Structure 1
């Protein structure tokens, strides 16, 4: 039947039917993932089985909180509470909350608009060059859509009110907001959600997902300047990106060479054991598939090393490198909503990052150089 064969569906129906291009796979995946080990106080690489979409909806909320540091530089604190037994996750940030006002076009409260309707954002005017992670106006709604319960709480000092709004059943139930007088306290936003574990094929939050979620909170402390992050009330202790990269020290002439190149670029280098490795952040987004920023940095290092060597194949140099990058890119573009891979051309970054000769010279003091010299005179022998 022609009418049965050709189907039209709503955008909301499509998201639930086909999560992949919105939040990534809802099937279990075997992955090698970095985990923060509390018994040894360091990052360890572990074979885990996780559902990427579940990890992603958490990440969407985390990155929104980090984005608030950009809009409000006075923001000091992010709290992440994971209540595994209760299947609830809370992310709270201080600094400016959400305006408690009726939108003069949409005729609803702004928090209801931007957490309860697709395609809503403060990031749609690209005349402003912004270094927020937020771009498309989907993130928070995707979390809501994949939650059985989703609660937004915010306090607005301009009106002196607190606003609490609950959605249920994959954003399909939207309860009216509870608005109360709020005097003589700080602004903040708190997002609480209970992921719809049925849609992720799970019955509980297991040790693998909790492990990667917790590490992602370390990432946030590592990548966002001048904030204090707490996990279930406990300080993560690290204060900057250098401290973050140092958590990898045990698993990795200094082992780690770190440099802030400018106010938008920090780079660290270590020698890799097996092959090319990268850990990179764009506006606090974890770019696990790398992209133009990673290639920009590594190409430079490879080119400069190669030139010193010729005075070997490029993949030979590259694959002895473990690179860490924390960068701020203007109005970035990615291959997908998950933002695993940056596609912004270098000329559109809004900044440059030239790696200085002094840094390259320091790399030439590491095992990387020894390994390349071996390849080199073997190539001469033949």
Structure 2
């Protein structure tokens, strides 16, 4: 007898109880990843990072929605454990919405306090925003001791003041000409194996904002008062001095050395696919299938597709993909159809193949054991 008693859970309850299917690990652990081009190994709690990224994602969504005519200044601030994200998008439409449970609640209130409530539930094939599930804001709110969202459309502002894991919710409206979005929160450090939003979280969010600045040059980000600049070839050279780049229509990619296994920083629209997934798998495949031809052809050697890739760092931004799909709320693994991906990425792997064959620093580790095993 382990009891098998059936119980039913509210959305908020379920978010609290199965938090890691919603935001990730609470534990303060050591992960390997990229910071400023360096494959370091650093200690953070992944869920805390997500709490920030949700609010950022939302602003960058609005920039996307309006082709950067709106939300082209995004101001991020991290000061004594308080995260502030301000943008100049159009604000959250203040119109009201009806929940099936009778109630009648202002637009932004539901956006921020009701899971399964957002503005990315349209025709999937046309959805270009990184946002889609309608939950990430409520996640930051549910895991915040204080959460305060301010939007205004140019007419009036609504403030939604939330405390203690969104069990205190209140909202007021006052007229105003301001038009944009501000969100401020303090994480609930009881759901996390830290008690401080210490310096590493500052490093990550800057690093994220640097990467967002190169995907999205029409947005001027600022972190803690300092504007974030961006030049893609400059960015890429942070990962390997001896890197090489190619930029297409819906694509910017860079290839460089790795000392210790395939590494990849890889973006799909405004989303960091830290676990890779289909897009990077497919382009590494199309890459390797011109390379191993030429390499076995230029040198008569056999090297494996794992050998090629266990020596590359890759950086790839895919812009403007419709209806992108993932296997988790954490959007860490692009899971869209291989065919539709390959339709968007117009990858000239031929190009990319010849330039990697003409870059000794990059080419040599691939074929090295193979050449030394030939004699």
Using the alignment, how far apart are the partners of 1:324 and 1:372 within structure 2? 18
Secondary structure at the aligned position of 2:147 is classed as strand
CA shift at 1:365, angstroms?
Answer: 1.6
List alignment gaps of at least 5 residues for structure 2.
298-302
The structure 1 residue matched to 2:172, chosen from 172, 175, 178, is 178
CA shift at 1:88, angstroms?
Answer: 0.7
The one-character-per-residue Cα deviations of 1:280-337 (angstroms, maximum 9, x if unpaired) are 0111111110000111111111111101012211111111111111013211111110
Using the alignment, how far apart are the partners of 1:352 and 1:33 within structure 2? 25
Partner of 2:280: 294
The structure 1 residue matched to 2:84, chosen from 90, 93, 98, is 90
Q: Determine whether 1:362 maps to 2:355.
A: yes
The structure 2 residue matched to 1:256, chosen from 243, 248, 254, is 243
Secondary structure at the aligned position of 1:26 is classed as coil
Q: Determine whether 1:229 maps to 2:260.
A: no
Partner of 1:70: 64
Using the alignment, how far apart are the partners of 2:208 and 2:77 within structure 1? 13
Using the alignment, how far apart are the partners of 1:368 and 1:218 within structure 2? 25
Task: Check the 8 A contact 1:33/1:212 in 2, yes or no.
Answer: no
Matches within 5 A, 1:302-313: 302-311=288-297, 312-313=303-304
Using the alignment, how far apart are the partners of 2:269 and 2:56 within structure 1? 12
Using the alignment, how far apart are the partners of 2:195 and 2:368 within structure 1? 53
Q: Determine whether 1:327 maps to 2:318.
A: yes
Task: Check the 8 A contact 1:147/1:193 in 2, yes or no.
Answer: yes
What is the number of equivalent residue pairs in this alignment?
A: 362
Task: Check the 8 A contact 2:116/2:134 in 1, yes or no.
Answer: yes
Secondary structure at the aligned position of 2:308 is classed as helix
Deviates more, 1:128-137 or 1:346-355: 346-355
The one-character-per-residue Cα deviations of 1:76-96 (angstroms, maximum 9, x if unpaired) are 21100111x2x2100111121
Partner of 1:40: none
Partner of 1:267: 253
The one-character-per-residue Cα deviations of 1:143-170 (angstroms, maximum 9, x if unpaired) are 110001111111102xx11111111111
Secondary structure at the aligned position of 2:96 is classed as coil
Q: Determine whether 1:81 maps to 2:77.
A: yes
Partner of 2:374: 380
Partner of 1:122: 119
Normalising by the residue count of structure 2, what TM-score does the alignment of the two structures yield?
0.90
Q: Determine whether 1:99 maps to 2:93.
A: yes
Task: Check the 8 A contact 1:330/1:348 in 2, yes or no.
Answer: no
Partner of 2:13: 13
Matches within 5 A, 1:126-145: 126-145=123-142
Task: Check the 8 A contact 1:30/1:47 in 2, yes or no.
Answer: yes
- In structure 2, relative to structure 1, the CA distance for the partners of 1:103 and 1:3 (3 Å cut) is same
CA shift at 1:271, angstroms?
Answer: 1.8
Using the alignment, how far apart are the partners of 2:4 and 2:315 within structure 1? 52
Task: Check the 8 A contact 1:161/1:181 in 2, yes or no.
Answer: yes
- In structure 2, relative to structure 1, the CA distance for the partners of 1:339 and 1:111 (3 Å cut) is same
CA shift at 1:210, angstroms?
Answer: 2.5
Secondary structure at the aligned position of 2:141 is classed as helix
Matches within 5 A, 1:206-245: 206-238=198-230, 240-245=231-236
Using the alignment, how far apart are the partners of 2:272 and 2:86 within structure 1? 20
Task: Check the 8 A contact 2:112/2:138 in 1, yes or no.
Answer: yes
CA shift at 1:35, angstroms?
Answer: 3.1
Using the alignment, how far apart are the partners of 2:285 and 2:330 within structure 1? 25
Using the alignment, how far apart are the partners of 2:40 and 2:370 within structure 1? 34
Task: Check the 8 A contact 2:265/2:314 in 1, yes or no.
Answer: yes
Task: Check the 8 A contact 2:255/2:314 in 1, yes or no.
Answer: yes
List alignment gaps of at least 5 residues for structure 1.
37-42
Q: How big is the alpha-carbon RMSD for the aligned residues of Structure 1 and Structure 2?
A: 2.1
Using the alignment, how far apart are the partners of 2:366 and 2:105 within structure 1? 63
Deviates more, 1:359-368 or 1:278-287: 359-368
Normalising by the residue count of structure 1, what TM-score does the alignment of the two structures yield?
0.89
Using the alignment, how far apart are the partners of 1:143 and 1:123 within structure 2? 18
Deviates more, 1:349-358 or 1:225-234: 349-358
